[PDB]
């Protein structure tokens, strides 16, 4: 997988968040993330992207948009993945597969176990 650049927009919620992306605005949702803290996880994920210098795009092997027309998409602040910051913190947790798009799910499952044993938020 690679990742590509993409420009901030407009932070959404805790799982979605509008970027620029190949000169096109585009809503991008979050691989493997569900949000059930709701207001919290939007501001982490906030915070996360408008602090960044750099946001980039990681598309996964499966579909890439949903039926919604939002990007199907890992996004890394400064190199950091926003979904699994999320996720570590007990703001979300790891979604079922979709679509063949299951890169990441085993190491996002550790960090929710992780955030479930520090009873950290939703696992509170």
């Known amino acids: ?3 590509e650049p993409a420009t901030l927009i407009k932070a959404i919620d805790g799982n ?16 493997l993330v569900d949000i059930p803290y709701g207001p919290e996880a939007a501001a982490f994920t906030k915070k996360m992207v408008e602090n960044a210098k750099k ?32 996720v570590r913190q007990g703001l979300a947790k790891v979604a079922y597969v ?3 798009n299951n890169t990441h799910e085993q190491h996002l499952r ?6 479930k044993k520090e009873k950290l938020n939703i696992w509170s």
């Open 16 to 31: 979605t968040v509008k970027l620029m992306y190949k000169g096109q605005p585009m809503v991008f949702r979050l691989l």
């Open 1 to 3: 997988l690679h990742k």
């Open 98 to 100: 979709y679509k063949g």
């Open 55 to 86: 946001i980039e795009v990681e598309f996964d092997k499966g579909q890439r948009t949903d039926k919604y027309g939002r990007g199907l998409a890992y996004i890394y602040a400064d190199g950091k993945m926003v979904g699994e910051a999320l």
């Open 110 to 115: 550790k960090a929710e176990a992780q955030a």
